[PDB]
């Protein structure tokens, strides 16, 4: 039939499975190099190896692979799912596993790929119930015994392979493991390739820039942004067109295309699989938005950018980059708001972090979570990880009486051994925030962990006309007023408190509009905020920081400061 | 004329420990 | 047949689910646009995605959409619920899902709703079952797999995402996760609207006002407010007549009152006039509490979010907590009020999830207001603490700031705090942003205190005079509490003077002068001058 | 009954329930009287069993649901009215809890039982 | 001193990639004493008194056992 012979040439190949070639590299040689060439092995005078375990985060292409493997291949294919086998009559699991080895080994030299064996062979210690170490024994027994495996090779795929007998994990068995991880930027780039084959893309998408842009996508992240970019384009697209009560016009098939704007859109909207847990409700700031404070923008923006945007001349100096940046001052200076520009206009993936939100009451947990995150973000390099209000996380350890249940000893030593210990040294940028330095672990501000100490004060002159344009960007405003005078008349306000300046001249015009306007109905009076309503609303305007907390910063900023004097 | 046999599991339960703070 | 003909009319379908047009446009697309011109899709060449995983609290909607869409298309529908798929012998759950799969590929084009999927997914971490792993991993190869399925659309409903493996929200099993929330006013309506086509109305009959007093309600509520109401109405008429063992021209004057809806919202699951005195508080807040909800259009033309937070501090039994349910009553808005040590417990790392919980409902059910009643319980100073319930403490303190003012979306919810003691909190609660309005309350005036009485005696049987003024002026050092429990004890002295005389018999409608002034001559103060003094010099250092 | 319907064999019981609800709707519009609810409405949240909450949803789809109930009124019976489903609970199913819970009440059940004051107030 | 060394690698950096921006508007195929020399302004040392302090009465506690 038509559609037949469309779908018997859609059939998978090695050509679709682009993104890893070594592993591709092994899994051809054992499976199809013996079978070209017996006769090298058997002058070299060695048997191949004849068992695999395809293993990785879900969704990189372990069952592509088999699926490509079955098709390229001229040997007979054995597809075995993973709760396929079992079922209540007692011993029926293992005939089933008999009966399949046995239809394999005397149809011809073929291949067994075994889907999830994460399920059908547990840790026979751990398992309580029977049927289950029966059948993981008879699949022991029956891979590897007496009189077996004649010219027969197995393949396994599992997300876990830690959860497997280590029985079945040695030669013979499972000779080695192939490890299908997470493409880099080439192989995100081929896999885009190879997605966009048989797309009618535009002429003006580029996928490169797209490839360098995606980050923690694990290949199958990259079918979804593909998918979702052409659902927007034919959303717009139809939105012209008709409702298409019958077969869709010719007119407007012949002129279909996708354009960057699409897969912009779906990358904006997009987030790898693996954060999907973690995913953050969408705020909008930009760097526009943070008045004042250019110096420590500007180093922000370098030292997060620099080891994503240009790695080449960091291998090249033979050095790595700092991972680390704390910043304490006083309460509202603008802390969350750079992590929230960061999030927002920096390429690298985002984790958010509230003080205590990964302390559990059970034992363990809290480290258990701290692991788990950990691991999502050295995965999904390069990642950003926030941690909000240091403090209540990581104390002096010890210091005076530690936790009643030593809990919080035990969860910061986890901390402390996940942001500097054996590890893999990615691309993880540990962002801090904290208004209280004095209560934190020494052991957490060394260079390494967190390398450099960025203090945020209270905006002068100009950081205050910087905040208060920035904050008045997209509000109507006359001519007639300058905020010259409002940014000299505080001389000691903090951008929280000029928001609140700003909130309540929005709010008395607010009230004027509508006393203006409910004279129109009973029988656009002012279009924007007038000199009058600003100099009303500082009548309730008081001070957000005391003197007593702004000396207590200050001092400890001249104390660290003061060892870095003698130079 | 044929009789026939059948294994199933049962559930069993656990135990677990708890830290707690204290003043 | 009598009973086919309401078999197509109950058929559900569009324009029977209300307040999700995005979400119901966003899985139309997804099920019908495919199976409505697949040629447009062969010549773009990309597959359609295939998967969806609708979210929300229970009762929302979510198996009436997937039912309307079914029903709509011709696509055949299967539902598959949690523990009726599950067994406990081994070996058997995964051939129910397996056969289900099958028949379903087998017959025809056709779409799943598996309901209640948390129930079957435990994560297979957190879980020491070996059926339910076994079931995950067999549902995974159904979904995905060497020629796993084809031309078949899956729907999961759940109220915990997040319990979910992570494998399953992978593409290809679980494209895109579509939240159904909560509806808002608009949704409310046309929900009743829907709901309202085939029952009979009264004339003195609006929706709108009810969309307005209910605040939680949704859907299925819905739908069974109306049920009972029109179900009390029909009992209500039946038995004031004559037990016939009738005529349709005395039946049919049925109608609904709005007296029926009223307690109907009463009873399944104050007002300005109450408060007497602070009349300046009240607009303030009245204006920051309903400007940002009754004009969002002109603050969406501005571009500035409004303010959130205010802070009442002052002497006991004043009234916050009045102002506080005026508030509640006065608008749409939900209330969730929650005192000071509540919070707290001797667990580790359980106060915090008791304080995420609240403001995750509060931002649910946007627009809120939520009232911290004794903030300074909770917002102890974080320096001076020195103790194991100190750190605690500062770890509490610092999730209260990270959840009012952290990375987050900014809903409408407002935060009122309440303290008597006003200089226990750490000063970065108080820091605009989070509680920018420092409010001080009063002991109230001769003219308060009188108008505060006759807001308590609004309802009360009175005489024709009372000369509220004596009793007024001779109270100078009282509180709000303390003249309600000096009319309460007026009431009761009423009430029992009238059973003592009534008692001989088997006498005075109203309470007398006399036994007001019997009620009055015994009275408690229970604010010192101390307490004013301290509140005064606060609230001058301030 | 409640613990009559029992099947285990090959999970019967809902076959027994159906062709219950099915006699009930067959031949004309009855009273259905399950007794003894509470043994077959396992909350579906405390049980780990399989039957149970298999028997629970198979009555929550026999009482609400697509062509559910054609002019037929269903009865239950129990001693505790809390270990039941909140699901089960609701309209259109068991909309209307009774609580039949004295002295001249227990006098006219001895008249009546003794047909063919201190036997009322001692028991 | 590893900071140290980040942060003069880190000023080599944006000195390179800015002559290359000049370029299209190896200039520096080595670290010099200037980049050292701005680096070594905020230089810190991690470790203070008390605790060296600490440190050395541990270590003299565990001599004089
Ligand atoms: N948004 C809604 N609009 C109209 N009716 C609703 C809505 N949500 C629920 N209902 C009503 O509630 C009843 C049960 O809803 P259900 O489909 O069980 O909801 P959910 O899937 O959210 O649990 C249905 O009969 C339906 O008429
Ligand atoms: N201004 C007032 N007008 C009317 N009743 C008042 C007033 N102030 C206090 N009350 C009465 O005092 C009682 C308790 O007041 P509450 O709001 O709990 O006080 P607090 O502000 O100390 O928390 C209420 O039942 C209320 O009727
Ligand atoms: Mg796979
Ligand atoms: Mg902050």
Not at chain 1, 323 to 335: A, E, R
Not at chain 1, 406 to 431: C, H, P, W, Y
């Amino acid at each position: 039939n038509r559609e037949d012979e469309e779908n018997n040439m859609n059939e998978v190949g090695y050509d679709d499975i682009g993104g890893c070639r070594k592993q591709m590299a092994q899994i051809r040689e054992m499976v199809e190099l013996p079978l070209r060439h017996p006769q090298l092995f058997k002058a070299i005078g060695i048997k191949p190896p004849r068992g695999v375990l395809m293993y990785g985060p879900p969704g990189t292409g372990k069952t592509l692979m088999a699926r490509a493997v079955a098709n390229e291949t001229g040997a007979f294919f054995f597809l075995i799912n993973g709760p396929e086998v079992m079922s209540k009559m007692a011993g029926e699991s293992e005939s089933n596993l008999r009966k399949a080895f046995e239809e394999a080994e005397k149809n011809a030299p073929a291949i067994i790929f075994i889907d999830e064996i994460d399920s059908i062979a547990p840790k026979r210690d751990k398992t309580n119930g029977e049927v289950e170490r029966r059948v993981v024994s008879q699949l022991l027994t029956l891979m590897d015994g007496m009189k077996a495996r004649s010219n027969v090779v197995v393949i396994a795929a599992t997300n876990r392979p830690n959860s497997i007998d280590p029985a079945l994990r040695r030669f013979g068995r499972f000779d080695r493991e192939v490890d299908i991880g997470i493409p880099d930027a080439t192989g995100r780039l081929e896999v885009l390739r190879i997605h966009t084959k048989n797309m009618k893309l535009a002429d003006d998408v580029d996928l490169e820039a797209l490839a360098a842009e995606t980050h923690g996508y694990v290949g199958a992240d990259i079918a979804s942004l593909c998918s979702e970019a052409a659902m927007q384009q034919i959303r717009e697209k139809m939105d012209l067109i008709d409702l298409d009560e019958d077969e869709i016009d010719a007119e407007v098939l012949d002129s279909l295309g996708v354009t960057m704007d699409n897969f912009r859109f779906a990358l904006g909207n997009s987030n790898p699989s693996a954060l999907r847990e973690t995913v953050v409700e969408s705020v909008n700031v930009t760097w526009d938005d943070v008045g004042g404070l250019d110096e420590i923008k500007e180093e922000l923006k370098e030292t997060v950018e620099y080891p994503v945007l240009h790695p080449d001349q960091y291998t090249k100096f033979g050095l790595s980059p700092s991972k680390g940046v704390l910043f304490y001052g006083p309460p509202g200076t603008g802390k969350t708001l750079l992590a929230k520009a960061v999030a927002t206009e920096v390429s690298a993936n985002f984790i958010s972090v509230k003080g205590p939100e990964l302390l559990s009451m059970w034992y363990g947990e809290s480290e258990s979570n701290i692991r788990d995150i950990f691991d999502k973000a050295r995965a999904a390099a390069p990642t950003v990880v926030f941690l909000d209000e240091l403090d209540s996380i990581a104390k002096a350890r010890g210091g005076s009486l530690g936790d009643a249940g030593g809990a919080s000893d035990r969860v910061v030593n986890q901390l402390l051994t996940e942001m500097d210990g054996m590890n893999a040294k990615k691309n993880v940028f540990v962002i801090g925030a904290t208004n209280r330095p004095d209560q934190i672990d020494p052991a957490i501000l060394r260079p390494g962990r967190l390398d450099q100490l960025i203090y945020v004060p209270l905006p002068d002159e100009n950081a205050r006309l910087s905040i208060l344009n920035a904050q008045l960007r997209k509000t109507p405003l006359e001519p007639g007023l300058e905020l010259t005078a409002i940014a000299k008349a505080t001389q000691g306000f903090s951008g929280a408190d000029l928001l609140y300046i700003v909130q309540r001249a929005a709010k008395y015009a607010i009230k004027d509009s509508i006393e203006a306007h409910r004279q129109h109905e009973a029988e656009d009076p002012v279009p924007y905020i007038t000199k009058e309503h600003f100099a009303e609303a500082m009548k309730t305007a008081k001070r957000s920081v005391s003197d007593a907390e702004l000396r207590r910063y200050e001092a400890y900023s001249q104390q660290m400061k003061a060892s870095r004097g003698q130079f | 004329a044929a009789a026939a046999a059948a294994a199933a599991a049962a559930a069993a339960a656990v135990a677990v420990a708890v830290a707690v703070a204290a003043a």
